[PDB]
Amino acid sequence: SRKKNILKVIILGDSGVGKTSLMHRYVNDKYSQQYKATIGADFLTKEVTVDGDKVATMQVWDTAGQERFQSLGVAFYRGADCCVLVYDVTNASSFENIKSWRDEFLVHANVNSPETFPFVILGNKIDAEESKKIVSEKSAQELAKSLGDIPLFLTSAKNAINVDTAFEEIARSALQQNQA
Protein backbone atom coordinates (compact mmCIF):
# COMPACT_ATOMS: atom_id res chain seq x y z
CA SER A 1 0.00 0.00 0.00
CA ARG A 2 2.00 3.01 1.23
CA LYS A 3 5.64 1.93 1.61
CA LYS A 4 7.53 2.06 -1.70
CA ASN A 5 11.10 2.13 -2.93
CA ILE A 6 10.74 5.69 -4.19
CA LEU A 7 13.22 7.39 -6.49
CA LYS A 8 14.90 10.08 -4.34
CA VAL A 9 15.89 13.21 -6.21
CA ILE A 10 17.70 16.15 -4.61
CA ILE A 11 17.54 19.57 -6.26
CA LEU A 12 20.55 21.79 -5.48
CA GLY A 13 21.68 25.28 -6.54
CA ASP A 14 22.08 28.90 -5.46
CA SER A 15 19.23 30.89 -4.00
CA GLY A 16 17.07 32.52 -6.69
CA VAL A 17 17.76 30.06 -9.52
CA GLY A 18 14.19 28.67 -9.40
CA LYS A 19 14.48 25.28 -7.67
CA THR A 20 11.08 25.62 -5.96
CA SER A 21 9.51 26.87 -9.17
CA LEU A 22 10.90 23.88 -11.05
CA MET A 23 9.60 21.42 -8.46
CA HIS A 24 6.08 22.88 -8.62
CA ARG A 25 6.08 23.03 -12.43
CA TYR A 26 7.05 19.35 -12.55
CA VAL A 27 4.89 17.96 -9.75
CA ASN A 28 1.86 20.23 -9.95
CA ASP A 29 2.15 21.78 -13.47
CA LYS A 30 1.63 25.15 -11.80
CA TYR A 31 3.79 28.26 -11.45
CA SER A 32 3.45 31.01 -8.86
CA GLN A 33 5.40 34.21 -9.46
CA GLN A 34 6.32 34.44 -5.79
CA TYR A 35 7.32 31.51 -3.56
CA LYS A 36 8.86 32.09 -0.14
CA ALA A 37 12.57 31.45 0.06
CA THR A 38 13.11 27.81 0.97
CA ILE A 39 14.09 26.97 4.53
CA GLY A 40 15.43 23.58 5.42
CA ALA A 41 14.47 20.77 3.09
CA ASP A 42 11.13 19.38 2.05
CA PHE A 43 9.81 17.11 -0.64
CA LEU A 44 6.90 16.39 -2.94
CA THR A 45 6.04 13.10 -4.61
CA LYS A 46 4.93 12.38 -8.13
CA GLU A 47 3.88 9.04 -9.62
CA VAL A 48 5.44 8.61 -13.06
CA THR A 49 6.07 6.18 -15.86
CA VAL A 50 9.58 5.71 -17.08
CA ASP A 51 10.11 5.09 -20.78
CA GLY A 52 6.67 3.71 -21.59
CA ASP A 53 6.33 0.78 -19.18
CA LYS A 54 7.99 1.26 -15.76
CA VAL A 55 5.97 2.86 -12.97
CA ALA A 56 7.75 4.58 -10.11
CA THR A 57 7.27 7.23 -7.47
CA MET A 58 9.60 10.22 -7.41
CA GLN A 59 10.38 11.96 -4.14
CA VAL A 60 11.70 15.38 -5.14
CA TRP A 61 13.58 17.23 -2.44
CA ASP A 62 13.70 21.02 -2.54
CA THR A 63 16.49 22.78 -0.65
CA ALA A 64 17.57 26.13 0.72
CA GLY A 65 19.94 28.00 -1.56
CA GLN A 66 20.71 30.65 1.13
CA GLU A 67 23.17 29.67 3.85
CA ARG A 68 21.19 31.49 6.55
CA PHE A 69 18.24 29.24 5.68
CA GLN A 70 20.10 25.89 5.58
CA SER A 71 18.96 25.03 9.09
CA LEU A 72 18.86 21.25 8.54
CA GLY A 73 22.42 20.75 7.35
CA VAL A 74 22.94 18.16 4.61
CA ALA A 75 22.32 14.76 6.19
CA PHE A 76 19.09 14.30 4.22
CA TYR A 77 21.16 13.98 1.00
CA ARG A 78 21.91 10.34 1.83
CA GLY A 79 20.01 7.67 -0.11
CA ALA A 80 19.55 9.88 -3.17
CA ASP A 81 19.15 8.24 -6.61
CA CYS A 82 19.84 11.43 -8.64
CA CYS A 83 21.13 14.93 -7.98
CA VAL A 84 19.88 17.95 -9.95
CA LEU A 85 22.17 21.01 -10.21
CA VAL A 86 20.30 24.19 -11.15
CA TYR A 87 21.79 27.47 -12.41
CA ASP A 88 20.11 30.66 -13.68
CA VAL A 89 21.15 31.64 -17.21
CA THR A 90 20.91 35.26 -16.16
CA ASN A 91 23.21 34.88 -13.12
CA ALA A 92 26.89 34.08 -13.73
CA SER A 93 27.75 33.28 -10.14
CA SER A 94 25.01 30.64 -9.96
CA PHE A 95 26.70 28.88 -12.91
CA GLU A 96 30.18 29.26 -11.48
CA ASN A 97 28.86 27.51 -8.31
CA ILE A 98 27.58 24.37 -10.08
CA LYS A 99 30.66 22.26 -9.39
CA SER A 100 30.71 23.22 -5.69
CA TRP A 101 27.13 21.99 -5.40
CA ARG A 102 28.05 18.73 -7.21
CA ASP A 103 30.94 18.30 -4.81
CA GLU A 104 28.92 19.18 -1.69
CA PHE A 105 26.51 16.45 -2.67
CA LEU A 106 29.28 13.92 -3.28
CA VAL A 107 30.90 14.53 0.10
CA HIS A 108 27.70 14.06 2.09
CA ALA A 109 25.37 11.73 0.20
CA ASN A 110 27.55 8.66 0.83
CA VAL A 111 27.22 7.36 -2.72
CA ASN A 112 29.39 4.37 -3.59
CA SER A 113 30.49 5.25 -7.13
CA PRO A 114 30.81 9.01 -7.55
CA GLU A 115 31.99 8.58 -11.15
CA THR A 116 28.77 6.88 -12.26
CA PHE A 117 26.30 8.61 -9.95
CA PRO A 118 23.72 10.49 -12.03
CA PHE A 119 23.73 14.31 -12.07
CA VAL A 120 21.58 16.48 -14.35
CA ILE A 121 22.26 20.21 -14.84
CA LEU A 122 19.36 22.60 -15.48
CA GLY A 123 19.99 26.11 -16.86
CA ASN A 124 16.71 27.77 -15.79
CA LYS A 125 15.02 31.02 -16.92
CA ILE A 126 15.71 30.49 -20.65
CA ASP A 127 12.60 32.57 -21.20
CA ALA A 128 14.49 35.69 -20.05
CA GLU A 129 15.18 38.55 -22.44
CA GLU A 130 18.22 37.78 -24.54
CA SER A 131 20.06 40.80 -23.13
CA LYS A 132 19.75 39.44 -19.60
CA LYS A 133 20.94 35.91 -20.48
CA ILE A 134 24.67 35.90 -19.86
CA VAL A 135 25.64 32.24 -19.44
CA SER A 136 26.22 30.66 -22.87
CA GLU A 137 25.00 27.16 -23.83
CA LYS A 138 28.48 26.46 -25.10
CA SER A 139 29.89 27.37 -21.71
CA ALA A 140 27.32 25.13 -19.99
CA GLN A 141 28.09 22.24 -22.33
CA GLU A 142 31.79 22.52 -21.60
CA LEU A 143 31.16 22.29 -17.86
CA ALA A 144 28.72 19.41 -18.19
CA LYS A 145 31.24 17.45 -20.25
CA SER A 146 34.07 18.28 -17.84
CA LEU A 147 32.01 16.96 -14.94
CA GLY A 148 31.58 13.58 -16.62
CA ASP A 149 29.31 14.11 -19.62
CA ILE A 150 26.36 14.99 -17.46
CA PRO A 151 23.09 15.83 -19.25
CA LEU A 152 22.28 19.50 -19.62
CA PHE A 153 18.79 20.95 -20.18
CA LEU A 154 17.79 24.59 -20.65
CA THR A 155 14.43 25.24 -18.98
CA SER A 156 11.77 27.67 -17.92
CA ALA A 157 9.61 26.78 -14.92
CA LYS A 158 7.69 30.00 -15.64
CA ASN A 159 6.74 29.28 -19.25
CA ALA A 160 6.72 25.47 -18.97
CA ILE A 161 9.68 25.03 -21.27
CA ASN A 162 11.58 21.75 -21.18
CA VAL A 163 10.84 20.91 -17.54
CA ASP A 164 9.06 17.75 -18.67
CA THR A 165 11.95 16.67 -20.95
CA ALA A 166 14.46 17.35 -18.20
CA PHE A 167 12.65 15.36 -15.56
CA GLU A 168 12.11 12.51 -18.03
CA GLU A 169 15.90 12.15 -18.02
CA ILE A 170 16.08 12.70 -14.25
CA ALA A 171 13.53 9.95 -13.73
CA ARG A 172 15.24 7.51 -16.08
CA SER A 173 18.67 8.16 -14.56
CA ALA A 174 17.28 7.86 -11.03
CA LEU A 175 15.59 4.58 -11.78
CA GLN A 176 18.78 3.16 -13.36
CA GLN A 177 20.79 4.21 -10.30
CA ASN A 178 18.09 2.88 -7.93
CA GLN A 179 17.97 -0.55 -9.53
CA ALA A 180 21.60 -1.02 -10.46
Ligand X SMILES: Nc1nc2c(ncn2[C@@H]2O[C@H](COP(=O)(O)OP(=O)(O)NP(=O)(O)O)[C@@H](O)[C@H]2O)c(=O)[nH]1
List, as residue ranges, the binding site for GTP.
15-21, 31-38, 65, 124-127, 156-158
- Rounded CA gap, 100 and 142, in Å? 16
The SS3 of residue 71 is: coil
User: In the sheet where 41-50 sits, what is the strand order?
Assistant: 41-50, 54-63, 7-12, 82-88, 119-124, 152-155
| Residue 156 CB, nearest approach to ligand X (Å) | 4
162 near ligand X, rule: CB under 6 A: no
Among 20, 59, 90, 155, binds Mg ion (CB under 5 A): 20
38 near Mg ion, rule: CB under 5 A: yes
For residue 146, report the phi and psi dihedrals to the nearest 5 degrees.
Answer: -60, -25
Among 26, 158, 166, 174, binds ligand X (CB under 6 A): 158
In the chain, count H helices and then E strands. Answer: 5, 6
38 near ligand X, rule: CB under 6 A: yes
63 near Mg ion, rule: CB under 5 A: no
| Residue 6 CB, nearest approach to ligand X (Å) | 22
- Which positions from 103 to 142 touch ligand X by CB under 6 A, shown as an x/- string? ---------------------xx-xx--------------
- Which residue number is nearest to ligand X in terms of Cβ? 65
9 near ligand X, rule: CB under 6 A: no
- Rounded CA gap, 48 and 54, in Å? 8
| Smaller CB separation from ligand X, 49 or 92 | 92
**Residue 47 to residues 54, 115, 144: CA-CA distances in angstroms?**
11, 28, 28
The bridge status of strand 119-124 relative to strand 54-63 is unpaired
> Binding residues for ligand X, per CB under 6 A?
15-21, 33, 35, 37-38, 64-66, 124-125, 127-128, 156-158
